[PDB]
Design a protein around this nucleic acid. Sequence first.
RNA 1: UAACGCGUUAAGCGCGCCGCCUGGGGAGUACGGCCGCAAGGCUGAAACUCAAAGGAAUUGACGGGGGCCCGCACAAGCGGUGGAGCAUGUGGUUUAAUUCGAAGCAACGCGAAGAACCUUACCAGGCCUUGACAUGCUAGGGAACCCGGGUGAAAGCCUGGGGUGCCCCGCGAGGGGAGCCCUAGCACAGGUGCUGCAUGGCCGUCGUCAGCUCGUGCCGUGAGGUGUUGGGUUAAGUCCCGCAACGAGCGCAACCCCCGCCGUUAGUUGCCAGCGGUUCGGCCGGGCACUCUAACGGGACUGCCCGCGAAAGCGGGAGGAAGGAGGGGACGACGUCUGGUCAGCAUGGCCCUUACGGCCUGGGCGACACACGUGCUACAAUGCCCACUACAAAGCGAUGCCACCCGGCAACGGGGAGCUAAUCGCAAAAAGGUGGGCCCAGUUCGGAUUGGGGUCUGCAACCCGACCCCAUGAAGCCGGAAUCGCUAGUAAUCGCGGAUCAG
Lengths: 206, 60, 157
Amino acid sequence: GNKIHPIGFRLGITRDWESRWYAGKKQYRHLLLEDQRIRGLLEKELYSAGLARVDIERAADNVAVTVHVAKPGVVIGRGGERIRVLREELAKLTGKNVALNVQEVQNPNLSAPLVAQRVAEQIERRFAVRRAIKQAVQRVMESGAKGAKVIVSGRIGGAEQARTEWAAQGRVPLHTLRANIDYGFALARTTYGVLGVKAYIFLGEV
Amino acid sequence: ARKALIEKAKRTPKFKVRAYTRCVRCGRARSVYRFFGLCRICLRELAHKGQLPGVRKASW
Amino acid sequence: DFEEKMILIRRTARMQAGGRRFRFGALVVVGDRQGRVGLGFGKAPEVPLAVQKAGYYARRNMVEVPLQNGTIPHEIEVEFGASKIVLKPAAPGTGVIAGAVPRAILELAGVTDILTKELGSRNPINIAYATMEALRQLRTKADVERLRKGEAHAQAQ
RNA sequence: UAACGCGUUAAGCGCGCCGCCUGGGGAGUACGGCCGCAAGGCUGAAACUCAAAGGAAUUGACGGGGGCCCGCACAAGCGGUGGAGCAUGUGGUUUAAUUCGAAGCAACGCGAAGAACCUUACCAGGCCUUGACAUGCUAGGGAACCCGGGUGAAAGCCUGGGGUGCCCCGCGAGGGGAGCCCUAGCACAGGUGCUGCAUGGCCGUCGUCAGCUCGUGCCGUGAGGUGUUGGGUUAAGUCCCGCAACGAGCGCAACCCCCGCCGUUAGUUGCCAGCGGUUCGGCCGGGCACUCUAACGGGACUGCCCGCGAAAGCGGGAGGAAGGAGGGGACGACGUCUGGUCAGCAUGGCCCUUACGGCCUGGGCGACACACGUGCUACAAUGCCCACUACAAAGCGAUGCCACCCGGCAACGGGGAGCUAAUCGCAAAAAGGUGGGCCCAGUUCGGAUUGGGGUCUGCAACCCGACCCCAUGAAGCCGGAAUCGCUAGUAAUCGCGGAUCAG
Ligand SMILES: [Mg+2]
Ligand SMILES: [Mg+2]
Ligand SMILES: [Mg+2]
Ligand SMILES: [Mg+2]
Ligand SMILES: [Mg+2]
Ligand SMILES: [Mg+2]
Ligand SMILES: [Mg+2]
Ligand SMILES: [Mg+2]
Ligand SMILES: [Mg+2]
Ligand SMILES: [Mg+2]
Ligand SMILES: [Mg+2]
Ligand SMILES: [Mg+2]
Ligand SMILES: [Mg+2]
Ligand SMILES: [Mg+2]
Ligand SMILES: [Mg+2]
Ligand SMILES: [Mg+2]
Ligand SMILES: [Mg+2]
Ligand SMILES: [Mg+2]
Ligand SMILES: [Mg+2]
Ligand SMILES: [Mg+2]
Ligand SMILES: [Mg+2]
Ligand SMILES: [Mg+2]
Ligand SMILES: [Mg+2]
Ligand SMILES: [Mg+2]
Ligand SMILES: [Mg+2]
Ligand SMILES: [Mg+2]
Ligand SMILES: [Mg+2]
Ligand SMILES: [Mg+2]
Ligand SMILES: [Mg+2]
Ligand SMILES: [Mg+2]
Ligand SMILES: [Mg+2]
Ligand SMILES: [Mg+2]
Ligand SMILES: [Mg+2]
Ligand SMILES: [Mg+2]
Ligand SMILES: [Mg+2]
Ligand SMILES: [Mg+2]
Ligand SMILES: [Mg+2]
Ligand SMILES: [Mg+2]
Ligand SMILES: [Mg+2]
Ligand SMILES: [Mg+2]
Ligand SMILES: [Mg+2]
Ligand SMILES: [Mg+2]
Ligand SMILES: [Mg+2]
Ligand SMILES: [Mg+2]
Ligand SMILES: [Mg+2]
Ligand SMILES: [Mg+2]
Ligand SMILES: [Mg+2]
Ligand SMILES: [Mg+2]
Ligand SMILES: [Mg+2]
Ligand SMILES: [Mg+2]
Ligand SMILES: [Mg+2]
Ligand SMILES: [Mg+2]
Ligand SMILES: [Mg+2]
Ligand SMILES: [Mg+2]
Ligand SMILES: [Zn+2]
């Protein structure tokens, strides 16, 4: 029972919300649940493309879902087909005019949610957990970053004794508010059980 | 949040008064906020993720 | 640009309220199989890191063994603490007839034939050091002749 | 030299000679021999049994060891708990069931920010079996869907009628097909069943305590040390001086929010200072001065003066709204607790599948010889009651808040205006002020308990709602041993709002 969610802390100061709209008490309840049904689906259907953020901006009967993705082709699809299928299935579950665009996360080495994931996969694929981490943190600092940190926790290896591995380089100042710090969390699901990967990436003093 | 009771939750019941809210997420019966249709656990979680719009953390 | 070897790796414990806390130690040899060998003992909190360290240290602590045809110029015996090594040079096709540690050190030195016994404490680390110190000490009817004549050398040579 | 240490008083370098050691326990025991007045001594085993016994040094922990420092920790206070009655939680016991977890601080008004049915996981009874929910599959019957009867506590069970859409082939009768439905059968779904000692996440905690560590260098055979220690300073591993150390990371601080002063921009639904008109209401003109509202900014740095100090900094003063972190917030280091939670969610493994799944109606979670925890209301005169009269903030509300009129002792009901709200409303703020009453009394203190008559919500207030009015008017006269909180706008005291919510 320790540290604060590094985002919700910085939220509004050095970090933005993933849903940006206004709604009165009357409407809010459902436009919320509507967002969560969207982010429910695109999260399942796009794990293959490595997806960082799902931005949901809103007007009136209008939804601008910006999907932030490593491999932007996989989202698009050959011919331009796959994206059309989504947009229809979206505007089905939404019943509104869904405006799904796609944005190329140009560097997955500085996207915490992705670094997290890449590790979790690696862990699921039965890779060495310690190495998996040092080597991830590695890749993060190599690409500009000013600080980074990854924490795998759970039944590491086979392990009856559930422990915690972690590693960091540079500064990861969780107390410093003006620090832009990306956080992401991945959950690895395994024959022996489930483990969690947190990845912190310190990006720049503002 | 047994499955049936999440469904029963939605069933428009024999009397107006067996109307009760659960969390649109976990299905939790108990600390459910009208306004979000979420419990005080889910609220907390989604709030930090940044997925409840305009929901800041307070401090005064 | 030498070969490295692992003499030994160990784990060791400190103490803090609420647990042991560990640290690793690596003993590493470094040789060029033609008369230069160095020994390094490095500790870090992670094992491969310790070895890196160890390897760095080894190259800074280097010793030129005067190899005389696969073997060492005379016999020699050297104590270090509790531990004591003896190196008796040997004839061709004898092999490094030496224990676990000294071998690694001798092999990378570039030695091929040599006799050996450890004696006293068998502790790796001190035996490691005793050997390196033994080799640090060898001389030659050459090395020696210069020491003794020396004070008018080059009248007879 | 293993180190501790030794170091011309050697434990160094050597020679001579003597004594002694050869794993721990058994054991300085047994046996034998010698000495002794005796007590007993000297000499001295093994069987057996263990896998160590040991020496020195390192980190830590602990000490009814020492030193310095801090926290409402003690002290100094103010007010309480422990007693009473009641509200809640819990132990126990009881029960058909009193679902389950929480268990020293860190469980006990805790999960529960809303248990009459629902919730609801427990119990009894009546029900369903591809199932209340997902994706399917094989075979037949069907459009989907809509309405009515029987039985029943409901669920369910049985049954009657209306209805023929869409896609392809065909002139057509019509065959095929998508979707949905029913019946049979199969994958399966469902499980708040177990394991928090298989876990993720999140949290409590030591502790907002000032610590925890790393790179390189250096010391040591080494575990490890150094730095981080010492002296001064600080809320602070905060800084200063010192030093085999020089830095760095997580922490402290800072960047963020609220309050205190002023600025610029902003004038409505807010504001009223001089002025015009007034039904005396800022009501109307008009104006944004002021109040305010709320978005950006300025302002404080030991900067100035005096005194002490190598320095850091400390004490005191001036200007200033604010002075040495101005007050409060958010923010919890490496780790500890095999801490908490499989009953939020997720999840490995084990277990059930006409039953541990699911539907319902009723009951239970509210039981009461008792015990504790947290709190409310009191025991009264620095009070109580009645009337008249002032001064808040923060929120909330168009399925709602409900102004004002009417009936009614009243709860409330009928009628009905404004308000998606700086406008309309909840809204009376209560302590306070003025007047009058009571006069030390179980009382005009206290308001339990019960009798009676109503109101509202709700399908339904027996178990088990709140509220109003009449009558009843219990304990209690300041609480034993123990024990809690708080260091300034704090404690004590007085009202107000909100979340959950038909209530
Ligand atoms: Mg931690
Ligand atoms: Mg963990
Ligand atoms: Mg479940
Ligand atoms: Mg309800
Ligand atoms: Mg030489
Ligand atoms: Mg010796
Ligand atoms: Mg030879
Ligand atoms: Mg030996
Ligand atoms: Mg041995
Ligand atoms: Mg002498
Ligand atoms: Mg001696
Ligand atoms: Mg013996
Ligand atoms: Mg023996
Ligand atoms: Mg004896
Ligand atoms: Mg004796
Ligand atoms: Mg004796
Ligand atoms: Mg005898
Ligand atoms: Mg005698
Ligand atoms: Mg004697
Ligand atoms: Mg000792
Ligand atoms: Mg002490
Ligand atoms: Mg006291
Ligand atoms: Mg007292
Ligand atoms: Mg009491
Ligand atoms: Mg219980
Ligand atoms: Mg349980
Ligand atoms: Mg309640
Ligand atoms: Mg019930
Ligand atoms: Mg029931
Ligand atoms: Mg046709
Ligand atoms: Mg036809
Ligand atoms: Mg399951
Ligand atoms: Mg645990
Ligand atoms: Mg438990
Ligand atoms: Mg060294
Ligand atoms: Mg320290
Ligand atoms: Mg502090
Ligand atoms: Mg510091
Ligand atoms: Mg006038
Ligand atoms: Mg006007
Ligand atoms: Mg400001
Ligand atoms: Mg000064
Ligand atoms: Mg801070
Ligand atoms: Mg446990
Ligand atoms: Mg209860
Ligand atoms: Mg009236
Ligand atoms: Mg009324
Ligand atoms: Mg009054
Ligand atoms: Mg009076
Ligand atoms: Mg009495
Ligand atoms: Mg009295
Ligand atoms: Mg204090
Ligand atoms: Mg209240
Ligand atoms: Mg309310
Ligand atoms: Zn929830």
